[PDB]
C-alpha cells in the first residue's frame, strides 16, 4: 500500500507481544525509516513511537491545543481531546485526519493536519493545521467523526467515516486538496439497521480486487462494560455494496465478526489494517479487565483464507 508503506518487513515473522506505554484508544500506525508511530485519541492527538514495534513509548502530541475554528462546529470543549486520528502518506506529505466532537452528539467536524515527516528530530517536522474537511450539525443524519482514507486501485482517494445516526459514510476526495469537492456526493455504505445504530470506526483496505470494510459494532467507552466487536464485509467496488460471508448487506446489519473479545480483553474495537508483502496486521484497542478496563493498544498478525476472508491467528 503506497499510502501505508512499511518497507521490507514481514509482519508474520514479528513479535507482537507489546511492552512499554500501551494506553491507547482508537489507534492507527505508520512507519517511516526505522521508526514506528502510533496516533490515537487524546489531548491534541497522542503519539507513541517505537524502534521495533514491540516496545512503545509516548512521544508527545500533534497539536499543543485546539485550533480556533473548532468552535464553529462544536460548543466550547473544556476537553482538549481530539478523536480517532487516521494517517496516510501521499506525495511526500503525511496526512493526519482526526475528529473534533462531544460525546453523544453529532455536532462534529473532521480536521486535517499535515507534516513533511513523522520524526521530530528532522528539521522539516511541523504539524500544520490545514483546517476542517467535512462536518455534521444536529440537523444532519450522519456523524462526522472516525475518518479513514483509502486510495482505490485507480489511485482515487476516498474518505470513509461515521458513527451512529445513519451509519458509515463515503465520499470522494480531490488529490490536490485531499478534501472532498464542494459538490461530491455523500454515500451511506453501512448500517446496523437498528436504533441506535451502533456501527462506527470504518477502515477500508483493498486486497486482490476486493475492498474490505472493517467497522466496529456496538459500544466503546464503558471500561469493562464495553461491547465493541470488530466486523468485516467486502465489495468488488469501493462504493459497494459491501456484504459479509453470508451474503448479507452491511447496510442491513451484515458483517462477519473478526473478534468479539473475551473476559480478559474486553470489547476490542476501532481497528486499522496494514499490509507488507503477503503479511498483514490488525491494530485496535481493547479494555483491560485486569487493569480497571483501561484501553490498551493491541497489534496482531492478520491472515487470510483461501476464500479471501481475513482472520486473526490463534
Ligand atoms: O473516543 C472514542 C469515540 O467514541 C466513539 O463513539 C462514541 C460516541 O457515541 C456515539 O453516539 C452514541 C449515541 O447514539 C445515539 O446516536 C445518541 O444520540 C448518541 O448519544 C457518538 O457517535 C460518539 O461520540 C467513536 O467511534 C470514537 O471516535
Ligand atoms: Ca479509525
Contacts of 284 by beta carbon, 8 Å cutoff, 6+ apart: 27, 230, 259, 268, 269, 270, 271, 272, 298
Q: Note whether 59 and 46 are within 8 A (CB).
A: no
Which position has the grid cell 480517532? 84
Q: Which atom of ligand 1 is nearest to the CA of 103?
A: 24
Tell me how far apart the alpha carbons of residues 218 and 234 are, in angstroms, rounded to a whole number. 20
- CATH class of residue range 1-314: mainly beta
Picking from 47, 41, 144, 148, the residue whose alpha carbon sits closest to that of residue 97 is 148
Picking from 163, 47, 60, 148, the residue whose alpha carbon sits closest to that of residue 102 is 163
- Extract the C-alpha cell encoding 118: 513523522
Residue 110 burial (CB count, 10 A) = 25
Interval between CA 164 and ligand 1 midpoint (Å): 7
Q: Note whether 39 and 3 are within 8 A (CB).
A: no
Q: Which atom of ligand 1 is nearest to the CA of 270?
A: 26
Q: Which residues, judged by CB distance below 6 Å to any ligand atom, belong to the binding site of ligand 1?
A: 25-26, 41, 83-84, 99, 101, 103-104, 143, 145-146, 163-165, 196, 200-201, 220-221
Q: Note whether 153 and 182 are within 8 A (CB).
A: no
Q: Whose CA is nearest to atom 5 of ligand 1?
A: 220
Measured between alpha carbons, how far is residue 161 from residues 31, 34, 78, 97 in Å? 23, 30, 25, 11
Entry resolution (Å): 1.9
Q: Note whether 33 and 300 are within 8 A (CB).
A: no
Q: Where are the domains of the chain?
A: 1-314
- Burial grade of 225 (CB within 10 A; 0-12, 13-18, 19 or more): exposed
CA 130 from centre of chain:
19
Q: What is the rounded radius of gyration, in angstroms, for the C-alpha atoms of the chain?
A: 18
Tell me how far apart the alpha carbons of residues 154 and 239 are, in angstroms, rounded to a whole number. 13
Contacts of 153 by beta carbon, 8 Å cutoff, 6+ apart: 206, 209
Tell me how far apart the alpha carbons of residues 278 and 111 are, in angstroms, rounded to a whole number. 33
Residues 221/114/130/127 CA torsion (nearest 10 deg): 80
Q: Which phi and psi (to 5°) does residue 53 adopt?
A: 95, -5
SS3 of the chain: the string is CCCCCCCCCCHHHCCCCCEECCECCCCEEEEECCEEEEEECEECCEEEEECCCCEEEEEEECCCCCCHHHHHCCCCCCCCEEEEEEEEEECCEEEEEEEECCCCCCCEEEEEEEECCCCCCCCCCCCEEEEEEEEECCCCCCCCCCCEEEECCCCCEEEEECECCCCEEEEECCCCCCCCCCCCCCEEEECCCCCCCCEEEEEEEEECCEEEEEEEECCCCCHHHCCCEEEEEEECCCCCCCECCCCCEHHHCCCEEEECCCCCEEEEEEEEEEEECCEEEEEEEEEECCCCCEEEEEEEEEEECCCCCEEECC
Is the bond preceding residue 196 a cis peptide, omega within 30 degrees?
Answer: yes
Interval between CA 165 and ligand 1 midpoint (Å): 9
Strand bridging mode 148-151 / 199-207: unpaired
Is the bond preceding residue 241 a cis peptide, omega within 30 degrees?
Answer: yes
Contacts of 228 by beta carbon, 8 Å cutoff, 6+ apart: 216, 217, 218, 219, 220, 261, 267, 268, 269, 270, 286
Tell me how far apart the alpha carbons of residues 202 and 160 are, in angstroms, rounded to a whole number. 6
- Extract the C-alpha cell encoding 26: 482508537
Tell me how far apart the alpha carbons of residues 156 and 124 are, in angstroms, rounded to a whole number. 27
Contacts of 216 by beta carbon, 8 Å cutoff, 6+ apart: 199, 200, 201, 228, 229, 230, 231, 269, 270, 271
Q: Whose CA is nearest to atom 13 of ligand 1?
A: 104
Amino acid at each position: 500500500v503506497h499510502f501505508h508503506p512499511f518497507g521490507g518487513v514481514n509482519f508474520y515473522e514479528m513479535d507482537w507481544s507489546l511492552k512499554g506505554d500501551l494506553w491507547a484508544h482508537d489507534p492507527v500506525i505508520a512507519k517511516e525509516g526505522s521508526r514506528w508511530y502510533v496516533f490515537h485519541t487524546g489531548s491534541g492527538i497522542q503519539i507513541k513511537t517505537s524502534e521495533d514495534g514491540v516496545h512503545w513509548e509516548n512521544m508527545g502530541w500533534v497539536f499543543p491545543s485546539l485550533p480556533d475554528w473548532y468552535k464553529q462546529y462544536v460548543p466550547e470543549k473544556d476537553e482538549d481531546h481530539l478523536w480517532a486520528p487516521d494517517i496516510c502518506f501521499y506525495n511526500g506529505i503525511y496526512y493526519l485526519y482526526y475528529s473534533v466532537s462531544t460525546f453523544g452528539k453529532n455536532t462534529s467536524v473532521i480536521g486535517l493536519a499535515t507534516n513533511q515527516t513523522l520524526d521530530p528530530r528532522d528539521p522539516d517536522y511541523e504539524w500544520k493545521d490545514m483546517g476542517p474537511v467535512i462536518h455534521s450539525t444536529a440537523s444532519d443524519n450522519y456523524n462526522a467523526i472516525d475518518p479513514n482514507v483509502v486510495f482505490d486501485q485507480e489511485g482515487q482517494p476516498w474518505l470513509s467515516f461515521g458513527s451512529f445516526w445513519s451509519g458509515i459514510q463515503l465520499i470522494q476526495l480531490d488529490t490536490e486538496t485531499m478534501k472532498p469537492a464542494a459538490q461530491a456526493e455523500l454515500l451511506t455504505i453501512a448500517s446496523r439497521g437498528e436504533e441506535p445504530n451502533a456501527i462506527a470506526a470504518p477502515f477500508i483496505v483493498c486486497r486482490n480486487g476486493y475492498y474490505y470494510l472493517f467497522v466496529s459494532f456496538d459500544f466503546c467507552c464503558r471500561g469493562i462494560e464495553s461491547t465493541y466487536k470488530i466486523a468485516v464485509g467486502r465489495s468488488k467496488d469501493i462504493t459497494g455494496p459491501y456484504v459479509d460471508k453470508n451474503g448479507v448487506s452491511m447496510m442491513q446489519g451484515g458483517g462477519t465478526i473478526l473478534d468479539e473479545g473475551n473476559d480478559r480483553w474486553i470489547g476490542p474495537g476501532h481497528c486499522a489494517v496494514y499490509f507488507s508483502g503477503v503479511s498483514a496486521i490488525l491494530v485496535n484497542h481493547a479494555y483491560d479487565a485486569l487493569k480497571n478496563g483501561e484501553p490498551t493498544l493491541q497489534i496482531r498478525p492478520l491472515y487470510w483464507d483461501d476464500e479471501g476472508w481475513p482472520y486473526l491467528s490463534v
